[PDB]
PDB file of C-alpha atoms in Angstrom:
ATOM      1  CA  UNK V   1      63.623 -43.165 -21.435  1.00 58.52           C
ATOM      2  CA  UNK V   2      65.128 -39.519 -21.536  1.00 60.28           C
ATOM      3  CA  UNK V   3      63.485 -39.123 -25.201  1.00 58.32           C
ATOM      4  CA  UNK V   4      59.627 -39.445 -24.415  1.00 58.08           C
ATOM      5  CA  UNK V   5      60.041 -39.784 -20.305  1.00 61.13           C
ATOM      6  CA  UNK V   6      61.990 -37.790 -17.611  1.00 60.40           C
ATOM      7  CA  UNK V   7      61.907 -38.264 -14.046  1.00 61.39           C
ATOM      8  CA  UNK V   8      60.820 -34.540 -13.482  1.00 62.70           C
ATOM      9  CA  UNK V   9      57.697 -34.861 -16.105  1.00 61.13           C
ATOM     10  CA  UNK V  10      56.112 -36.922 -13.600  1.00 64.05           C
ATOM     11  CA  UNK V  11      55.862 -33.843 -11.547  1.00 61.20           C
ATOM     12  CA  UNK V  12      53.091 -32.654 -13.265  1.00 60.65           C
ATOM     13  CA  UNK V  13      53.158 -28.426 -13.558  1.00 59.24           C
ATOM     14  CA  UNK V  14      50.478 -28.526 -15.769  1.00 58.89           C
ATOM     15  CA  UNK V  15      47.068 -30.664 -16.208  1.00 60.31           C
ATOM     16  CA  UNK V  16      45.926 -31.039 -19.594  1.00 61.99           C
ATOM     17  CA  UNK V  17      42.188 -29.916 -20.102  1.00 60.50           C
ATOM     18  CA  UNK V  18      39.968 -33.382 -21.550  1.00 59.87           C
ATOM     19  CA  UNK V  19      38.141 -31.714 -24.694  1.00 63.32           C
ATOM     20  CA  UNK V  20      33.460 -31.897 -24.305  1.00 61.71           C
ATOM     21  CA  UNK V  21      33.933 -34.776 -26.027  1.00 62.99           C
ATOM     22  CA  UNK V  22      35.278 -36.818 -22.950  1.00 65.72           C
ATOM     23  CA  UNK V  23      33.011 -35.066 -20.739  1.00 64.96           C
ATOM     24  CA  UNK V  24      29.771 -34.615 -22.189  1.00 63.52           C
ATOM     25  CA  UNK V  25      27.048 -31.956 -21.093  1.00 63.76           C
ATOM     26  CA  UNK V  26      23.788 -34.604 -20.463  1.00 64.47           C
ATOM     27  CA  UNK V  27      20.398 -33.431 -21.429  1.00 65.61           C
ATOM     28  CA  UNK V  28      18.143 -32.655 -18.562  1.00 66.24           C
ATOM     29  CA  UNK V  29      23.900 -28.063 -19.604  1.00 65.87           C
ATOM     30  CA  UNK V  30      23.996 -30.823 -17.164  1.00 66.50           C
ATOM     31  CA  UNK V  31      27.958 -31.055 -16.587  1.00 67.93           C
ATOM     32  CA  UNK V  32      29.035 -33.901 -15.649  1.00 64.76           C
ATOM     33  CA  UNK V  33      30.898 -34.488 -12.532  1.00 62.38           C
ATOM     34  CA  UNK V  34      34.986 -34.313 -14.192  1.00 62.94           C
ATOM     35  CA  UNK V  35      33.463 -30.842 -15.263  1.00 61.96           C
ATOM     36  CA  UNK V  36      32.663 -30.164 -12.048  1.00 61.72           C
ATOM     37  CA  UNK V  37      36.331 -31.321 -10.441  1.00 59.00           C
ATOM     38  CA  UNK V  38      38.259 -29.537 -12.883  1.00 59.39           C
ATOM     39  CA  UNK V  39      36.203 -26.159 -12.126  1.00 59.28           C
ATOM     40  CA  UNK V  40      37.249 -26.739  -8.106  1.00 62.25           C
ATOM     41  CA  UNK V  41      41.082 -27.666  -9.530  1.00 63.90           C
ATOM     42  CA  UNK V  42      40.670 -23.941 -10.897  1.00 63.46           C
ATOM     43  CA  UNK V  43      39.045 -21.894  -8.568  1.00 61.43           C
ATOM     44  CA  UNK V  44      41.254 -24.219  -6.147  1.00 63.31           C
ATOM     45  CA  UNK V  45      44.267 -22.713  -8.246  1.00 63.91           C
ATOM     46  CA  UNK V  46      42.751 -19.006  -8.946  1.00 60.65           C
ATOM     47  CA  UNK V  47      42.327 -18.582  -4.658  1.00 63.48           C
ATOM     48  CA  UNK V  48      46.099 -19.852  -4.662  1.00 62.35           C
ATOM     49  CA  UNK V  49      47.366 -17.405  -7.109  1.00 61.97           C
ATOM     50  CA  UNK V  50      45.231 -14.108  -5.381  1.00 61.36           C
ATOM     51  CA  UNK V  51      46.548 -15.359  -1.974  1.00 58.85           C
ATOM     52  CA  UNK V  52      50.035 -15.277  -3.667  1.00 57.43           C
TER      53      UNK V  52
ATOM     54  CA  UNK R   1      -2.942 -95.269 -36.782  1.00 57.32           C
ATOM     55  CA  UNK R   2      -3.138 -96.472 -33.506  1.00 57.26           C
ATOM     56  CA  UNK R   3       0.298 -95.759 -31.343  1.00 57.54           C
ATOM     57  CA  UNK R   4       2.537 -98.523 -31.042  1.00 55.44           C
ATOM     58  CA  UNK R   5       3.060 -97.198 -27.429  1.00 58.23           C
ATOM     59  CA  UNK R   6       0.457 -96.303 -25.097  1.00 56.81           C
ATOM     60  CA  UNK R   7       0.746 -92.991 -24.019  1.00 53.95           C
ATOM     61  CA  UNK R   8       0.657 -91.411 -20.293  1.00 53.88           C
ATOM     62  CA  UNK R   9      -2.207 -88.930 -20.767  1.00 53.43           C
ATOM     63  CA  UNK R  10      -4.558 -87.208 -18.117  1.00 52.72           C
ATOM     64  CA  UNK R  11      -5.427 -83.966 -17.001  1.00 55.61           C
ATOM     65  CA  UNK R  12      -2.927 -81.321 -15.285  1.00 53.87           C
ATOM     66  CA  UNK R  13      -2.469 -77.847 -13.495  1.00 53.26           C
ATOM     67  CA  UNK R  14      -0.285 -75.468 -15.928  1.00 49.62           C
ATOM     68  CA  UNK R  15       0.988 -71.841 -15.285  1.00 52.14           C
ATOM     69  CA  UNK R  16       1.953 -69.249 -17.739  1.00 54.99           C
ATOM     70  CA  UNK R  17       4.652 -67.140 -16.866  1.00 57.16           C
ATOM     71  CA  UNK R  18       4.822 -63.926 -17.079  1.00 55.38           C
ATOM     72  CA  UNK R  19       8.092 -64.755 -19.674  1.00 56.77           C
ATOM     73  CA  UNK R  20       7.187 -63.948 -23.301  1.00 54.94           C
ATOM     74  CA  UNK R  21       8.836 -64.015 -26.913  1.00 55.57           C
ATOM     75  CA  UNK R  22       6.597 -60.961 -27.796  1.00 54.75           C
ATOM     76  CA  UNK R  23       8.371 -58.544 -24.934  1.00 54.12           C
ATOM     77  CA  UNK R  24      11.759 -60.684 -25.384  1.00 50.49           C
ATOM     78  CA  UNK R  25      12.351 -60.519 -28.712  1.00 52.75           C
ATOM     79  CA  UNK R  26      14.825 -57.529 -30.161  1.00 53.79           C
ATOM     80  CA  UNK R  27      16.422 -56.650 -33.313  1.00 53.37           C
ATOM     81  CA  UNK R  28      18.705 -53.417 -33.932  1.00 52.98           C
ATOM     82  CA  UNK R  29      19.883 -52.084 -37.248  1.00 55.47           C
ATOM     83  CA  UNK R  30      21.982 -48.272 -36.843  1.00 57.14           C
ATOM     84  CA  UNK R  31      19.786 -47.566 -34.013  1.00 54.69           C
ATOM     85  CA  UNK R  32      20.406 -44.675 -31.387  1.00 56.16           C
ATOM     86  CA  UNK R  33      24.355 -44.359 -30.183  1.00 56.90           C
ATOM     87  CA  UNK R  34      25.264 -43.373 -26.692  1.00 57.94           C
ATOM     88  CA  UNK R  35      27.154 -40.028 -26.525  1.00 55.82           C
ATOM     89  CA  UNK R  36      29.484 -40.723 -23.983  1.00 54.94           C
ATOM     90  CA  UNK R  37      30.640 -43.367 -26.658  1.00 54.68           C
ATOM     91  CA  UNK R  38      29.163 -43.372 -30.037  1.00 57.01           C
ATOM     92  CA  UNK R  39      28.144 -46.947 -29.705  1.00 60.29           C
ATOM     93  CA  UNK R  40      24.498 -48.687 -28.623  1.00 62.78           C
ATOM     94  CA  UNK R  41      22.548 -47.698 -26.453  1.00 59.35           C
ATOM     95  CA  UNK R  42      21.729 -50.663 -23.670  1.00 62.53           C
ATOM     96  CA  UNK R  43      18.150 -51.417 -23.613  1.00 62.76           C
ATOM     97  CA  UNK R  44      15.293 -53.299 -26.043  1.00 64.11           C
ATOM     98  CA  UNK R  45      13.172 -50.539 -24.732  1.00 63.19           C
ATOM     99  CA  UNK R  46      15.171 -47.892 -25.788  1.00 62.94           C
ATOM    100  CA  UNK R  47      16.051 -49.917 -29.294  1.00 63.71           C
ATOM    101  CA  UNK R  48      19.338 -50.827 -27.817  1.00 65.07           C
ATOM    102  CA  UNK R  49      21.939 -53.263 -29.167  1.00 63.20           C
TER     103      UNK R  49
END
């Protein structure tokens, strides 16, 4: 559906950051472990854009 | 009044298991919510729901 789909929107060019809420810091912060993949995604993509 | 049946009666060997009401028994009214969730926590322990 060309109003709220398109064949190139499912190439994603940008990934949408999930707010604290869905990833809560547990008391021991303690990140949890979508905190910690989302920093790798952007060191992953801050190396990428220096080697560029 | 004396039973209109006899009865089967006589001594016997019983166990009590370690299974009680007192540590089985729960009850939760706006307790502590999960933060992940908002919703009750899982646990009598921990005054779960």
């Amino acid at each position: 559906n060309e109003v709220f789909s398109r064949p190139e929107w499912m190439i994603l060019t940008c990934l949408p950051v999930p707010p604290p809420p869905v990833r809560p810091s547990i008391s021991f912060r303690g990140e949890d472990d979508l905190t910690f993949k989302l920093a790798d995604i952007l060191k992953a993509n801050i190396s990428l854009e220096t080697l560029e | 009044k004396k039973l209109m049946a006899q009865i089967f009666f006589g001594p016997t060997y019983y166990q009590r298991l370690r299974h009680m009401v007192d540590d089985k028994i729960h009850a939760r009214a706006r307790g502590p919510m999960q933060v992940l969730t908002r919703q009750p926590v899982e646990g009598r322990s921990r005054d779960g729901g």
